[PDB]
Amino acid sequence: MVRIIVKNVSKVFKKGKVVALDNVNINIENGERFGILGPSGAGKTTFMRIIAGLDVPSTGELYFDDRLVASNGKLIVPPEDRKIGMVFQTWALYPNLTAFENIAFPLTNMKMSKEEIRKRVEEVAKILDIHHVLNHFPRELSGGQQQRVALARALVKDPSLLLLDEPFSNLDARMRDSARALVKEVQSRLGVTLLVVSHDPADIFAIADRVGVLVKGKLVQVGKPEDLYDNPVSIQVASLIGEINELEGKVTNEGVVIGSLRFPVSVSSDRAIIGIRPEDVKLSKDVIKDDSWILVGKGKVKVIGYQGGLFRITITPLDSEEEIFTYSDHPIHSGEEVLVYVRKDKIKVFEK
């Protein structure tokens, strides 16, 4: 319901010495679910605070539709005038207000009578299915209920933009899937534009349709999650979006050579980085007659681990110390030589 134009946005701290965000350009479309993925300190919360209007770009401009909301150190349109709903790191509910009072809070100075407030709150509470615990204080609410109350509070003024800052923390864990589904259900019901920032790729895969990856304040890649996953711009982005094996080798004619292993790819460099995800490696004692799998050579199991009912097998190429791990329900033991197969079109290669 709102289009966000982020234009040449930068943010500095410490008198210009620290650049938290560097020349960020993004156009987020109306109703798009957009995610930002990056490691702690990449500048995620800074970006979010700027979209929220809690801070401003040091240089550059920010537009909501055609409205200039912030510009070069100046807050033009404040948070309360931006039609935003916010769910941050916690459900930051007021501990001493009932769920009803929490949801009613943002309507305090909206020129609404008591009955008008009551009706809006109950209506939103019913849609989020917490109408029945409106008299509970937050502490008496389950995790699922708290989420719903915090969302209700964020949606009580009918925003066109929902902002989520690491809403599924390292808390939850067995409840994260439910919370993700709720967010998505809410977004599709309302058509709101949505921005979620997180360091966890799982949040992004579950919610975002397009994702930007932030590294040290710079947006290094933007695309669909599947696109970052299969076609990462660098090994750092490759590993941020999911598990991957990183190997160093020599660019020798017929591919990249790493000990007894040869990868049918190349780069205009002397040495190269090979990225190959665990699901794209298969170990075998005999030939694989499959045009999907490609033989890259022989290897030897270095060590084996086990978890989630699955074996984690680590091999190295002959005469090499570089390791490749992969998962299987079939264990192969230390010292055993094997054939290493990979999905041809799944090999990633970068200049060293």
Phi-psi region of 179 (alpha: psi -120 to 50; beta: other; left: phi over 0): alpha
* Residue ranges in the chain assigned as alpha helix (H): 44-52, 99-104, 114-127, 143-155, 176-190, 201-207, 225-230, 235-240
Cβ contact 192:16 at 8 Å = no
CA–CA gap between residue 216 and residue 147 (Å, rounded): 31
CA–CA gap between residue 257 and residue 272 (Å, rounded): 9
Residue 186 tokens read as 């809410």
Cβ contact 242:213 at 8 Å = no
166 is in an annotated binding site: yes
CA–CA gap between residue 258 and residue 320 (Å, rounded): 7
Residue 154's identity, in one-letter code, is A
Q: Which residues pair with 28 in a beta bridge?
A: 4
43 is in an annotated binding site: yes
Determination technique used: X-ray
DSSP 8-state class, residue 260: T
89 is in an annotated binding site: yes
CA 125 to chain centre: 29
46 is in an annotated binding site: yes
Q: Which domains does the chain have, with CATH numbers?
A: 1-245 (3.40.50.300), 246-279+343-352 (2.40.50.100), 297-341 (2.40.50.140)
